[PDB]
Amino acid sequence: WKQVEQLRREGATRIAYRSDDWRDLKEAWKKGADILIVDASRLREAADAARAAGEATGDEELIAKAEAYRDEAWKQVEQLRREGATEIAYRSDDWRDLKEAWKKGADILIVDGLRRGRIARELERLAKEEGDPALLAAAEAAREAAWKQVEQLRREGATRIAYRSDDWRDLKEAWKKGADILIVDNRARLRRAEEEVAETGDPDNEELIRETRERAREEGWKQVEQLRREGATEIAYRSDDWRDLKEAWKKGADILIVDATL
Ligand SMILES: [Cl-]
Ligand SMILES: [Cl-]
Ligand SMILES: [Cl-]
Ligand SMILES: [Cl-]
């Protein structure tokens, strides 16, 4: 936020902050974040392993009080929902976590299809390499596991359903299933692009990294441009690169997701 107001200077409107840390979430709330993105599944995994530490360390301050820690995490976020117009977006790939977040209170439910979409993509390509049509069908069911969560949330009456992926084809299909907010996550493309310049014979070449990271940016913006042609309205963009987020606003993304890395 000490360096995010540059995005607030141009266009602005909607800024989302992604974190599971309460201190950063509170500071983002006070700094004017329009949407807070909290991972209900990441908070659950840290919970089921917290009381596991209390069983290992030899301490009773943690055992029989872990249920108080979990409920406390829900309450501090729900209190933020009341005190302001800042929206709380809960994200998970797990159906029980989504219904729990809906019960606890959520303005946006984000069906996370990023990992499952990538696993389906690698299974499809692996099936093509093996010439196995059965593995093709296996790969397709890995994506429909996330689309079915979207359409079931639509059937039960969820108001604001979101979907996270890295590819416009998965997001368009989720959009047809009932998702209204399409989240493009471009962090992996920048990560892979930077990992490749480190493998070159001249990795310190400051000229050869500029366009390689740029090509990874155009691949992200291309997802936004194609979704804009299909007719999508609310498009969100996730990236840890400053130029990637700024230019994505001009491409058609009206929600920019920042985090502590920015
Ligand atoms: Cl095949
Ligand atoms: Cl909702
Ligand atoms: Cl997200
Ligand atoms: Cl895909």
Residue numbers in the entry: 7 to 268
What did the published study say regarding this structure?
This variant contains a stabilizing salt bridge cluster in the lower part of the β‐barrel (Kordes et al., 2022). Here, we introduced two or three helical insertions into minimal loops in the de novo designed TIM barrel sTIM11‐SB.
In the case of HalluTIM3‐1, the crystal structure shows all three intended hallucinated extensions in their entirety, verifying their successful incorporation into sTIM11‐SB. One minor deviation between HalluTIM3‐1 and the base scaffold is observed within the N‐terminal α‐helix of the barrel, as these residues do not form a continuous α‐helix. In the case of HalluTIM3‐1, the crystal has an uncommonly high solvent content of 78% (Matthews coefficient: 5.6), that may influence the quality of the data and in combination with a certain flexibility of the extensions, lead to the rather noisy diffraction data. Upon comparison of the obtained crystal structures to corresponding structure predictions using ColabFold, we observed an accurate prediction for HalluTIM2‐2 with a root mean square deviation (RMSD) over all Cα atoms of about 1.2 Å but found major differences in the case of HalluTIM3‐1 as the RMSD over all Cα atoms is over 4.1 Å. These discrepancies are mainly due to the different angles of the extensions from the barrel core, especially for insertion 1 that does not form a continuous α‐helix. The structure prediction shows straighter extensions, whereas two of the extensions in the crystal structure tilt more to the outside. When comparing each individual extension with the corresponding prediction, we observe accurate predictions below 1.0 Å RMSD except for the first extension of HalluTIM3‐1, which shows a higher deviation with 2.34 Å. The theoretical scattering curve of the predicted structure shows a high χ 2 of 8.9, whereas the crystal structure matches the experimental data with a significantly lower χ 2 of 2.0, indicating that the crystal structure matches the protein in solution more closely. In contrast, in HalluTIM2‐2 and HalluTIM3‐1, a major pocket is formed through the introduced fragments above the C‐terminal end of the inner β‐sheet. These pockets show differences in size with pocket volumes of 1006 Å3 in HalluTIM3‐1 and 2000 Å3 in HalluTIM2‐2.
